[PDB]
Short mmCIF file of C-alpha atoms and ligand atoms in Angstrom, two decimals:
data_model
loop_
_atom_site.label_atom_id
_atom_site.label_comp_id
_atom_site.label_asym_id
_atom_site.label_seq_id
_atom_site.Cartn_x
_atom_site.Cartn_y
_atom_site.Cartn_z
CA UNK A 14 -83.48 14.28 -88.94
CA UNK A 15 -86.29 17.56 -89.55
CA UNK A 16 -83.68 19.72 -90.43
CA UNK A 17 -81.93 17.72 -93.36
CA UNK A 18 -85.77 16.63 -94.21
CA UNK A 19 -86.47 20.56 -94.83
CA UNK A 20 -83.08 20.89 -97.33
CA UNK A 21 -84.08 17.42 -98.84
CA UNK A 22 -84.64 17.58 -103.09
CA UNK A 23 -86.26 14.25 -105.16
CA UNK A 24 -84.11 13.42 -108.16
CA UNK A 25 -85.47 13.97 -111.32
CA UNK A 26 -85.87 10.29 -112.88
CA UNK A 27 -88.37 9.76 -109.44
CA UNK A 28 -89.60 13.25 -110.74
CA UNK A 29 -91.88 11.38 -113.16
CA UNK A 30 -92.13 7.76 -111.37
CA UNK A 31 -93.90 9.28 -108.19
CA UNK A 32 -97.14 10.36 -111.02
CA UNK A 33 -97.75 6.27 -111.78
CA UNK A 34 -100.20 4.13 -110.08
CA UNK A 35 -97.50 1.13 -110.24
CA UNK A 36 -94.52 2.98 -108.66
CA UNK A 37 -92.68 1.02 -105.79
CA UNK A 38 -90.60 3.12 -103.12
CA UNK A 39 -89.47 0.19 -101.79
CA UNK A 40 -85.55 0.65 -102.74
CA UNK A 41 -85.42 4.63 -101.92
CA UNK A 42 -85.80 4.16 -97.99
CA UNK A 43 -83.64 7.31 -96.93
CA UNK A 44 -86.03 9.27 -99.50
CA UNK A 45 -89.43 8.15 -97.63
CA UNK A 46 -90.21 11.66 -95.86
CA UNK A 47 -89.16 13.57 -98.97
CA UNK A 48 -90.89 11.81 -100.89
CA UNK A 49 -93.81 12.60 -98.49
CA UNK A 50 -93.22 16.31 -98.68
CA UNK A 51 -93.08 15.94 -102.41
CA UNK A 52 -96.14 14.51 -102.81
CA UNK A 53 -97.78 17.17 -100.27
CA UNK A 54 -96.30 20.44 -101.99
CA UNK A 55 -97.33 18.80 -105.83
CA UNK A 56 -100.79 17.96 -104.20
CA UNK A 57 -101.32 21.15 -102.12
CA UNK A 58 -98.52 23.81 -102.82
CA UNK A 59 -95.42 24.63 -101.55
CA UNK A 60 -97.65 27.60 -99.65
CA UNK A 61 -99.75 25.73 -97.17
CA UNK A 62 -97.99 23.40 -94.39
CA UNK A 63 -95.44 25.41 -92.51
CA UNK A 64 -92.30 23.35 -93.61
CA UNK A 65 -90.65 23.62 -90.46
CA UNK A 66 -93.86 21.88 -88.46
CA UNK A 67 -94.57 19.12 -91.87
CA UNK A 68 -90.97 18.23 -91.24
CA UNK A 69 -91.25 17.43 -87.52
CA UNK A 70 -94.55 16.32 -88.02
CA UNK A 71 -93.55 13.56 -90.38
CA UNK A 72 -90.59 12.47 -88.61
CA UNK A 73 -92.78 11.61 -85.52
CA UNK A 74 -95.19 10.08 -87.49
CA UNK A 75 -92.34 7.60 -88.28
CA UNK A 76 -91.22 7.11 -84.88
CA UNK A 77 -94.19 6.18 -84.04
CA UNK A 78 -94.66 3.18 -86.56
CA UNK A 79 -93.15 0.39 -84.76
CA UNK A 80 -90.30 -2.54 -86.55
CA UNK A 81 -93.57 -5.13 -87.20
CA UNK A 82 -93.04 -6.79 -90.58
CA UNK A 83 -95.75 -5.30 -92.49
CA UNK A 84 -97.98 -2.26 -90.62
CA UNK A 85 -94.99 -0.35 -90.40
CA UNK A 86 -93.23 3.03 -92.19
CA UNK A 87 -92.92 1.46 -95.44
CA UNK A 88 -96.60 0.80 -95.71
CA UNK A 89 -97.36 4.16 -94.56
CA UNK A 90 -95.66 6.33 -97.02
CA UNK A 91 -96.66 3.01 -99.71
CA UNK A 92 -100.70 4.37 -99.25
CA UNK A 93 -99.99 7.96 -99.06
CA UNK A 94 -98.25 7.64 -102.55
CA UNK A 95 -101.33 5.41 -103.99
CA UNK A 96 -103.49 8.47 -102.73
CA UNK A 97 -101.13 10.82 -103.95
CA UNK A 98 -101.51 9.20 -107.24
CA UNK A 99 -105.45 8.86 -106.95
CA UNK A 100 -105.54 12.47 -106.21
CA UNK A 101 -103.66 13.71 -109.11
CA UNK A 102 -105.51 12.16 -111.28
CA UNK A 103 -109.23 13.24 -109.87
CA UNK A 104 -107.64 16.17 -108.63
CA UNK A 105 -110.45 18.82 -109.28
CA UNK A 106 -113.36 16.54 -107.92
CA UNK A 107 -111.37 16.78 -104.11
CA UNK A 108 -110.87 20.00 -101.80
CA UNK A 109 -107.76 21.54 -101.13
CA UNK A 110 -109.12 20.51 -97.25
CA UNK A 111 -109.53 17.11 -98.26
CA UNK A 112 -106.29 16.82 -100.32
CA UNK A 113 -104.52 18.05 -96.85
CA UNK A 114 -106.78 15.63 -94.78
CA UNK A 115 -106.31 12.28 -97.15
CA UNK A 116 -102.33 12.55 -97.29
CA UNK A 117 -101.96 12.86 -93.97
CA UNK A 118 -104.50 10.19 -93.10
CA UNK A 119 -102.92 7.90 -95.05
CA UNK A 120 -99.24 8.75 -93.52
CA UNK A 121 -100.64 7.74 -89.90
CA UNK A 122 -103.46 5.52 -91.03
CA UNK A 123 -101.76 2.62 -89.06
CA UNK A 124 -99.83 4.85 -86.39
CA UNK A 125 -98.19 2.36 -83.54
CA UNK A 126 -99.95 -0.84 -84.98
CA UNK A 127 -98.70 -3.99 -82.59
CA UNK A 128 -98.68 -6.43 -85.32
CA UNK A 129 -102.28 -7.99 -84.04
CA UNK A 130 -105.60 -7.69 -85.35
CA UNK A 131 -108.96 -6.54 -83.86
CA UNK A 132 -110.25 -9.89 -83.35
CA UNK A 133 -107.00 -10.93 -81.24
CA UNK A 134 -107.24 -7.34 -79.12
CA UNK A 135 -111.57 -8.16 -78.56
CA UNK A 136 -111.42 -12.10 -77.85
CA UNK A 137 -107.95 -11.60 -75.34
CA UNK A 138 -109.82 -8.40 -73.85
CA UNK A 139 -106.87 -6.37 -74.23
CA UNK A 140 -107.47 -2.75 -73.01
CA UNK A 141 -107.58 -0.62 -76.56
CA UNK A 142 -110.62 -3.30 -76.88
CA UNK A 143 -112.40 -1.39 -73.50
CA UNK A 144 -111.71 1.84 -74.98
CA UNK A 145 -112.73 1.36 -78.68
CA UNK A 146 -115.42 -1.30 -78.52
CA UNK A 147 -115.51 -1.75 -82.68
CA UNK A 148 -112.97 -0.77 -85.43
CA UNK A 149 -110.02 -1.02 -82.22
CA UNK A 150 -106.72 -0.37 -84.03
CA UNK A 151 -107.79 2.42 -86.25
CA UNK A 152 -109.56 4.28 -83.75
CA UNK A 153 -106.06 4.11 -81.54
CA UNK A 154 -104.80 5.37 -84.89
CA UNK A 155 -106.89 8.33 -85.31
CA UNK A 156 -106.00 8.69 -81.10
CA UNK A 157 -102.02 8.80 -81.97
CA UNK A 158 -102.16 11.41 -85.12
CA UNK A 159 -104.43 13.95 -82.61
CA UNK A 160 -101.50 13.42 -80.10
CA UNK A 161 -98.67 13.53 -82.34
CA UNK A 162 -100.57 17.42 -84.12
CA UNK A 163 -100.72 18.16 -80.07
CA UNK A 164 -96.91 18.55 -79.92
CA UNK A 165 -94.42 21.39 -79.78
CA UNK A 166 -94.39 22.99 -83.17
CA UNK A 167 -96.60 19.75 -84.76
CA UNK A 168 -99.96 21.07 -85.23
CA UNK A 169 -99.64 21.89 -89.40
CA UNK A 170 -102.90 22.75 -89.35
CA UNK A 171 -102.83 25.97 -86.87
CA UNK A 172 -103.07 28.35 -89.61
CA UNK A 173 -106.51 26.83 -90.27
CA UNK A 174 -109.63 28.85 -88.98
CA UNK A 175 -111.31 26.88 -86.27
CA UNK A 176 -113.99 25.71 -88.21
CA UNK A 177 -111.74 24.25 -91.14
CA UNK A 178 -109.76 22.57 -88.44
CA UNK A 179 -112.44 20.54 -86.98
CA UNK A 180 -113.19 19.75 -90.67
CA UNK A 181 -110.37 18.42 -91.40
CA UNK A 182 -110.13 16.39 -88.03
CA UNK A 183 -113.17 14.52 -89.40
CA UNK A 184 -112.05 13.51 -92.99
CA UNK A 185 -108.93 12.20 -91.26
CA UNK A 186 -110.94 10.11 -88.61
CA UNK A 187 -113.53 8.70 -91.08
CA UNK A 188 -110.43 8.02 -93.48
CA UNK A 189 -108.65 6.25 -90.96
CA UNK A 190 -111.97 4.47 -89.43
CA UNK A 191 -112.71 3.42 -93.36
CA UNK A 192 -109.55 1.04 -93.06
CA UNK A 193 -110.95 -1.17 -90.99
CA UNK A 194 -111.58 -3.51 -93.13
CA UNK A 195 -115.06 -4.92 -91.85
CA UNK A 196 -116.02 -1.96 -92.50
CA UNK A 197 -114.96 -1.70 -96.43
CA UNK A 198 -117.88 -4.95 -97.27
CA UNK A 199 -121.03 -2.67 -96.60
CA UNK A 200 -119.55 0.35 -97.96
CA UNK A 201 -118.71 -0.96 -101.37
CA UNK A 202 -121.64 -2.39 -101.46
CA UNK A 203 -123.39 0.56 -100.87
CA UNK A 204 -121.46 2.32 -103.28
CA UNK A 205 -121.88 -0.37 -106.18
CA UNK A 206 -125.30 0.16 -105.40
CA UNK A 207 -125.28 3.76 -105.91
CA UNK A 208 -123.24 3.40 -108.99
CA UNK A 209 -125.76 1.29 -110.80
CA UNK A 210 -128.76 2.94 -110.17
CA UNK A 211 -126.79 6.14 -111.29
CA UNK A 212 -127.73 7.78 -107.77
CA UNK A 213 -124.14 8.29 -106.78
CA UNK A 214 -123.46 12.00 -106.13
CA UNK A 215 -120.21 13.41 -105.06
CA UNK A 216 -121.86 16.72 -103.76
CA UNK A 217 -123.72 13.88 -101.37
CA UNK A 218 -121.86 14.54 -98.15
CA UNK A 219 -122.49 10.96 -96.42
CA UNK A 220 -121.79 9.70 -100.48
CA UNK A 221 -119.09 11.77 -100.72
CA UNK A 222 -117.77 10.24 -97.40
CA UNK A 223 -117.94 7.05 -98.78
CA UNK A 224 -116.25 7.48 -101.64
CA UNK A 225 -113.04 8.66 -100.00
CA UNK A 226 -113.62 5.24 -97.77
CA UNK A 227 -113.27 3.14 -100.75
CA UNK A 228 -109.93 5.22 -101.98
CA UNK A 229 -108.74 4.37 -98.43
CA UNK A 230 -109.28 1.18 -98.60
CA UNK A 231 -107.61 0.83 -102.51
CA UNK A 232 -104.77 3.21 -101.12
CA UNK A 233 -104.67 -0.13 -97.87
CA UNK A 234 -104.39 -2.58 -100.62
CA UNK A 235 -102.35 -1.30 -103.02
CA UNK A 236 -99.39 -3.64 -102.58
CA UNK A 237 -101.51 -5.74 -104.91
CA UNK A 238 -101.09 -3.18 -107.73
CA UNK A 239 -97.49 -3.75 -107.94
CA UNK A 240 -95.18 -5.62 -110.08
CA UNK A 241 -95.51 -9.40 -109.41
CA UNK A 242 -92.39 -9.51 -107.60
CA UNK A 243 -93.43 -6.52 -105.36
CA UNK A 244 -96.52 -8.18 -104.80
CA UNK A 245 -94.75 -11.51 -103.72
CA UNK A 246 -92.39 -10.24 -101.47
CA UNK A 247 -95.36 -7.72 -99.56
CA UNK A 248 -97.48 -10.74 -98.63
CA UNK A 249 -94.21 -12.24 -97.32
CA UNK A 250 -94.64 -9.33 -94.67
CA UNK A 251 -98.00 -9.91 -93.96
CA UNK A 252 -98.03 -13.62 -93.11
CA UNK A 253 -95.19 -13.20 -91.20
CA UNK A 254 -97.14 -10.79 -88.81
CA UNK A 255 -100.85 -13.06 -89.47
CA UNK A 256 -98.16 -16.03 -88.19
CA UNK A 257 -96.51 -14.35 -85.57
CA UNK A 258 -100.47 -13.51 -83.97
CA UNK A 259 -101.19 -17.23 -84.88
CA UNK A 260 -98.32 -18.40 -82.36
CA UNK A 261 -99.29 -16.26 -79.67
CA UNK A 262 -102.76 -17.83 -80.01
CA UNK A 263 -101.38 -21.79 -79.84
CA UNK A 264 -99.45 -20.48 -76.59
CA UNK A 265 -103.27 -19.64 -75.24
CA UNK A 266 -104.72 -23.15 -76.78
CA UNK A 267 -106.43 -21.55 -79.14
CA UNK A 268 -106.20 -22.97 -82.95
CA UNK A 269 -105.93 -19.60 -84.80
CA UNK A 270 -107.48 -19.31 -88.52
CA UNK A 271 -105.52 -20.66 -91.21
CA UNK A 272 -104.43 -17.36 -92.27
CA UNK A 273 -102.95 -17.05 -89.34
CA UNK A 274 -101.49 -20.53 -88.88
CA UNK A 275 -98.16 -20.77 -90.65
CA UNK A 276 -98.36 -24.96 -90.42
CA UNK A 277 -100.85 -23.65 -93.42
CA UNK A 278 -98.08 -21.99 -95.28
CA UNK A 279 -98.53 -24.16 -98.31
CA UNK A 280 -102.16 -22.85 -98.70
CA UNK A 281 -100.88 -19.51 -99.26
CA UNK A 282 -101.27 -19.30 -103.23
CA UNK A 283 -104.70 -20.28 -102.66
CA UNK A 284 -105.33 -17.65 -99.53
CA UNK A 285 -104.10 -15.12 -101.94
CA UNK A 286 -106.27 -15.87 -105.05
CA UNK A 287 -109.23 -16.11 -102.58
CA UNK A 288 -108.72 -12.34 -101.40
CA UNK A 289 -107.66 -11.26 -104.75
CA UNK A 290 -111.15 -12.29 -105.83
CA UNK A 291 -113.83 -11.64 -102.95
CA UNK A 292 -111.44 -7.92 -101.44
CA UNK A 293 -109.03 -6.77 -104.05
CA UNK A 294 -110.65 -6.92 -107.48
CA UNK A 295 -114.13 -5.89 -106.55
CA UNK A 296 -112.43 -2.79 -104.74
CA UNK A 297 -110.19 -1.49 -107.87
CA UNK A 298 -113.69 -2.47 -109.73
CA UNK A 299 -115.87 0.18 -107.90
CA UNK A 300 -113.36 2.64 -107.47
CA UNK A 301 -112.68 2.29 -111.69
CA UNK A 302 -116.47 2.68 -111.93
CA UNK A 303 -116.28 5.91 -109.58
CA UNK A 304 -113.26 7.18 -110.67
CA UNK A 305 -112.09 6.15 -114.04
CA UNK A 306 -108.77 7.35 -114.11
CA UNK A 307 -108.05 5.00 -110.99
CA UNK A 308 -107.77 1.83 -113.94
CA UNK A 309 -104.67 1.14 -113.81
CA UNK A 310 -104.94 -0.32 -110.50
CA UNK A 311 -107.23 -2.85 -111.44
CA UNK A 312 -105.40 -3.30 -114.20
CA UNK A 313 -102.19 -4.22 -112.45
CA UNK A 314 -104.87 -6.51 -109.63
CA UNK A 315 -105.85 -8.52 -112.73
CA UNK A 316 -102.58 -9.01 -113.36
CA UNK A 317 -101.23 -10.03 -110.02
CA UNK A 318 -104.39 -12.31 -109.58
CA UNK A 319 -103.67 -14.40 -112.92
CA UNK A 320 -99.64 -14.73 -111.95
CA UNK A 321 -101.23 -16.77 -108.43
CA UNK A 322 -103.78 -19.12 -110.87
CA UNK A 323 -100.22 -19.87 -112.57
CA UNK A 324 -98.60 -20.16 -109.42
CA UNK A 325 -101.50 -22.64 -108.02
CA UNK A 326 -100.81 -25.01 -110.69
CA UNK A 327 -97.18 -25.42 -110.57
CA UNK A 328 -95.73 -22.21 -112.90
C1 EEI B 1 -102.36 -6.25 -99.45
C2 EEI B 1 -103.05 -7.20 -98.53
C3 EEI B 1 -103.87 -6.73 -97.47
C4 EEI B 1 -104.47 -7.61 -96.64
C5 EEI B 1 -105.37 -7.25 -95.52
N1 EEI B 1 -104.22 -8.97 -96.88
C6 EEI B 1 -104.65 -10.11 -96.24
C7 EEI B 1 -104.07 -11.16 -96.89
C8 EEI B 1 -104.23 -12.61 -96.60
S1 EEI B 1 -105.27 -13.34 -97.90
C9 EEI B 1 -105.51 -14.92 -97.24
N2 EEI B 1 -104.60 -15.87 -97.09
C10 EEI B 1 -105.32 -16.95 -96.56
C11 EEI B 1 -104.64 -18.20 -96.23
C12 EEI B 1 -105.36 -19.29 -95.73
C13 EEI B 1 -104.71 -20.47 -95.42
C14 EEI B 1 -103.33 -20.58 -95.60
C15 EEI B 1 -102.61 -19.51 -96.08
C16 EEI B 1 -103.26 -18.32 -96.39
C17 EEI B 1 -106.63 -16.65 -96.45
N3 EEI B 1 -106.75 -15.34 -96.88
C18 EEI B 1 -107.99 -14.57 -96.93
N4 EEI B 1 -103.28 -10.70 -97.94
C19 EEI B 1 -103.38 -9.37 -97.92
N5 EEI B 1 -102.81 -8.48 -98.74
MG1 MG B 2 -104.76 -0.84 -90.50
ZN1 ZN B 3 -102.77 -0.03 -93.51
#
C-alpha cells in the first residue's frame, strides 16, 4: 500500500478541481492518500515530509479510521481538502509550521472514532470518559496521531528541531480539541466579537489560536458546502451513526434525543434547516468576515440551506 502511494501521480483534470472550495472526492476513493500527498507537497513543498515516512504515515492514519458510516476515511481526507483549499487561498497569513500542523490535524482529526458521541461515552461512564473528563473523543484523537508519529519510520516531523516539534504538537492538539463542537459556540462568539470591534489580530497568539479553531470547525462541516446532492447523501451517513447511538440507548431505557431517534426520521428536513441556521451559516459567516477568500463556502451553505426550506414544503 506505502510503496505504490510513493509512485502515485493525480490526473490532470483533478489538477485544477482539488484548488475549489466545492470539490467532492467522493467518487476517486483509490486516489484518497494521493490526493493527500498532493495537497501536502502544493501546500508545503515537495522538500519537507520525508516521502517514504508521509506515505506510511498516511496509510496508518487510514487504518486506523474504523467502517462507521460517517467519522470515517472519507471524512478525513473530505476536511483536509477544505483546509487545503482554505490554506491556498490565505496562504501567506499561515506558517509553513502551521500549514504542516493543520493538514495533518485534519487527516487524524477523528482518528478511531466509535460512531458515539461525548455525551453517550460521559452519561454510560465509558472509560475514554475517566481519562478525558471534557472534549472525550478528540482528545483520544489527538492520543492516536502521537501514537501513530511514535511508530517505526512514522514520525514526519523528526527533521524538526526540538523546539519546532513541540510547536507543532500543539497546533495539532488545539486543532483537533477545536472540533469538539461545544467548544466551536464560545469561540465564534468570541471571534465575532473581536471582528466587530475591529480588535481581531492575527499576530494575537491566543487570537490567532482561535482563528485556526473556527477553520477547523468550517473544514468539520464542510459536507454542507457541497452540491445539494452531496449534501443529501452526507447527512444520510450521519443519521445513520446519530440512529445507530439512539438504539443502543432504547436497549438501556433511555429515550435518546430526536436526533438520535430514527422513529424521528421524518423530522429530518427540519433538523437540518435548524443546524444550517444556528451551526453552519454563522460559521462560514465569521470565517468570510476573517478570511474573505473563504466565501464561497458560505456561498454554497446558503445554497444548501434554501434547497431544505424547498424540501420542508413539499419540493
Ligand atoms: C455536516 C454535519 C455535521 C454535524 C455535526 N451535523 C449534525 C447534524 C444533525 S442536524 C439535526 N437534525 C436534527 C433532527 C431532529 C429530529 C429529527 C431528525 C433530525 C436536529 N439537529 C440539530 N447534521 C450535521 N451535519
Ligand atoms: Mg469529531
Ligand atoms: Zn470530523
Amino acid at each position: 500500500e506505502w510503496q505504490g502511494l510513493m509512485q502515485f501521480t493525480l490526473p490532470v483534470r483533478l489538477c485544477k478541481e482539488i484548488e475549489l472550495f466545492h470539490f467532492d472526492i467522493g467518487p476517486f476513493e483509490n486516489m484518497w492518500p494521493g490526493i493527500f500527498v498532493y495537497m501536502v507537497h502544493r501546500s508545503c513543498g515537495t522538500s519537507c515530509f520525508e516521502l517514504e515516512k508521509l506515505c506510511r504515515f498516511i496509510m496508518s492514519v487510514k487504518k486506523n479510521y474504523r467502517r462507521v458510516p460517517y467519522h470515517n476515511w472519507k471524512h478525513a481526507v473530505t476536511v483536509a481538502h477544505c483546509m487545503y483549499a482554505i490554506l491556498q487561498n490565505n496562504h501567506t497569513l499561515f506558517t509553513d509550521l502551521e500549514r504542516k500542523g493543520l493538514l495533518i490535524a485534519c487527516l487524524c482529526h477523528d482518528l478511531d472514532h466509535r460512531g458515539f458521541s461525548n455525551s453517550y461515552l460521559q452519561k454510560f461512564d465509558h472509560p475514554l470518559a475517566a481519562l478525558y473528563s471534557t472534549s472525550t473523543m478528540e482528545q483520544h484523537h489527538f492520543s492516536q496521531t502521537v501514537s501513530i508519529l511514535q511508530l517505526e519510520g512514522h514520525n514526519i516531523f523528526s527533521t524538526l528541531s526540538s523546539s519546532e516539534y513541540e510547536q507543532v504538537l500543539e497546533i495539532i492538539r488545539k486543532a483537533i480539541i477545536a472540533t469538539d463542537l461545544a467548544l466551536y459556540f464560545g469561540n465564534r462568539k468570541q471571534l465575532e466579537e473581536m471582528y466587530q470591534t475591529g480588535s481581531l489580530n492575527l499576530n494575537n497568539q491566543s487570537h490567532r489560536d482561535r482563528v485556526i479553531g473556527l477553520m477547523m470547525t468550517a473544514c468539520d462541516l464542510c459536507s454542507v458546502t457541497k452540491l445539494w446532492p452531496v449534501t443529501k447523501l452526507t447527512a444520510n451517513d450521519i443519521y445513520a451513526e446519530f440512529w445507530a447511538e439512539g438504539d443502543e440507548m432504547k436497549k438501556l431505557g433511555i429515550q435518546p434525543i430526536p436526533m438520535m431517534d430514527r422513529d424521528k426520521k421524518d423530522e429530518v428536513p427540519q433538523g437540518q434547516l435548524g443546524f444550517y441556521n444556528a451551526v453552519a451559516i454563522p460559521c462560514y459567516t465569521t470565517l468570510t468576515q476573517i478570511l474573505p477568500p473563504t466565501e464561497p463556502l458560505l456561498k454554497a451553505c446558503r445554497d444548501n440551506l434554501s434547497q431544505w426550506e424547498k424540501v420542508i414544503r413539499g419540493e
